[PDB]
Amino acid sequence: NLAPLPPHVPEHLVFDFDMYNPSNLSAGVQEAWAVLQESNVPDLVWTRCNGGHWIATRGQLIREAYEDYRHFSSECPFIPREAGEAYDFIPTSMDPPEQRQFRALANQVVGMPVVDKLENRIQELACSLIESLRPQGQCNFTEDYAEPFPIRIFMLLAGLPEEDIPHLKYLTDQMTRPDGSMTFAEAKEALYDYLIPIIEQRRQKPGTDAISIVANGQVNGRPITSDEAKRMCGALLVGGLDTVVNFLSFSMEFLAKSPEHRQELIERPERIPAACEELLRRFSLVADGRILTSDYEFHGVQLKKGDQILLPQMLSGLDERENAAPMHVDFSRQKVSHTTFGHGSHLCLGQHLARREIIVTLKEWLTRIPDFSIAPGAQIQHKSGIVSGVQALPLVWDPATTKAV
Numbered sequence: 072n073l074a075p076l077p078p079h080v081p082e083h084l085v086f087d088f089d090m091y092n093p094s095n096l097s098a099g100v101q102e103a104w105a106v107l108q109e110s111n112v113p114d115l116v117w118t119r120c121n122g123g124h125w126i127a128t129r130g131q132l133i134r135e136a137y138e139d140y141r142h143f144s145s146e147c148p149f150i151p152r153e154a155g156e157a158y159d160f161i162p163t164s165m166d167p168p169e170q171r172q173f174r175a176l177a178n179q180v181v182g183m184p185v186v187d188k189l190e191n192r193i194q195e196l197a198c199s200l201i202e203s204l205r206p207q208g209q210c211n212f213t214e215d216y217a218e219p220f221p222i223r224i225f226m227l228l229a230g231l232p233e234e235d236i237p238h239l240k241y242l243t244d245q246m247t248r249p250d251g252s253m254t255f256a257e258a259k260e261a262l263y264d265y266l267i268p269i270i271e272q273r274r275q276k277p278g279t280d281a282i283s284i285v286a287n288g289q290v291n292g293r294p295i296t297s298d299e300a301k302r303m304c305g306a307l308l309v310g311g312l313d314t315v316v317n318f319l320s321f322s323m324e325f326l327a328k329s330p331e332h333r334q335e336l337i338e339r340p341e342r343i344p345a346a347c348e349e350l351l352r353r354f355s356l357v358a359d360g361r362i363l364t365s366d367y368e369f370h371g372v373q374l375k376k377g378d379q380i381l382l383p384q385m386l387s388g389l390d391e392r393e394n395a396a397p398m399h400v401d402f403s404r405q406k407v408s409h410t411t412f413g414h415g416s417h418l419c420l421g422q423h424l425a426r427r428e429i430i431v432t433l434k435e436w437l438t439r440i441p442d443f444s445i446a447p448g449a450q451i452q453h454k455s456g457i458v459s460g461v462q463a464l465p466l467v468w469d470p471a472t473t474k475a476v
């Protein structure tokens with residue numbers, strides 16, 4: 072539903088890439104985007120798909136525009152338009168130096184200190200979980216593990232009840248992989264009308280979970296209001312329901328067709344760190360944007376005031392000039408170049424936890440279920456969005472080859 076070409080876009084910088092459904096989806100989801108980095112693709116194109124918008128296709132320009140907030144603002148960082156002008160979360164839809172008050176506060180509820188504390192709670196779900204699993208010879212990897220372990224971790228951290236996950240999940244997915252049952256604006260209010268009551272409770276009866284401390288923190292030098300704490304929370308509810316859980320399907324995905332990464336891991340327990348790093352470049356997955364503040368000429372291409380630019384965080388690490396052999400998985404990559412976690416002021420607050428959670432995951436999974444395969448005959452589907460996704464990942468193993476810890 073290609074938008075017609077704004078008068079100021081050259082016909083020749085036009086590339087019709089569809090970020091919610093790109094042509095080559097079946098190749099996989101990092102395979103479909105990589106088509107942007109092909110030799111017939113200008114560094115910097117426009118698609119008229121999802122309302123017409125720019126796309127930087129190369130690590131250096133993604134990084135660069137990620138660097139330059141005065142020109143490239145995260146006021147509207149979502150494609151489409153409606154979603155971004157809709158998007159208001161906090162710190163994510165701010166620019167320096169607003170952002171910096173609120174980000175520090177989103178950093179109290181999830182930044183390193185929190186992860187250390189949560190250490191054994193993270194350790195004991197990951198091993199509970201695989202153990203309950205390993206005797207069956209079988210799981211849909213998505214819903215058996217990729218979903219319950221980070222999410223339950225985040226409910227634990229947010230002190231939200233677990234009965235609530237299926238609603239919070241379905242609504243958060245409607246902001247990154249919309250079914251088209253509902254607008255973003257729609258998804259988002261509905262999320263807020265869940266939040267808004269808990270926030271109100273928690274400012275009254277102030278707790279030790281992410282929502283009360285966020286509820287009850289201060290910024291700038293005065294009380295955070297109920298309204299900002301609400302937009303403070305709806306980032307969180309997203310990195311916690313839905314970047315981690317997908318990236319997991321991603322990599323078990325991977326661990327499943329490749330004996331030797333599995334085999335190299337079990338006898339390199341300290342390669343796990345490097346491994347996790349490399350699975351971040353190789354299954355990078357987020358993509359969001361910026362809106363131009365002004366008319367601005369970037370790398371010879373006239374951007375105008377208000378135009379949107381997709382800066383796929385996912386691309387940077389996939390570009391053959393930041394890394395030799397982009398598609399090939401290697402564990403001792405001498406420099407894992409990426410922006411999986413973002414680039415700029417907005418560097419993922421949730422990184423340390425994601426990691427944690429990837430690390431333990433691989434250390435526990437390989438530890439008790441070393442050998443496991445794609446359930447057979449199945450072809451694995453991915454979905455494409457602001458957060459790219461795995462639909463379903465049936466896994467199979469001989470239980471004779473598992474280890475109780």
Ligand code: HEC
Pocket residue numbers: 145148161162163170174177181306307309310311314315318356357359360384411412413414416417418419420421422424425
């Ligand atoms: C507990 C929170 C949490 C977890 C888990 C998490 N994130 Fe984040 N992420 C955040 C928050 C909060 C921000 C906004 C911080 C700021 O504004 O400076 C953010 C920001 C981002 C950005 C910034 C992009 C933009 O608009 O610039 C990217 C990319 C990102 N996260 C990727 C991920 C990836 C990948 C994972 C999965 C492995 C993940 N996040 C897991 C909370 C999370």
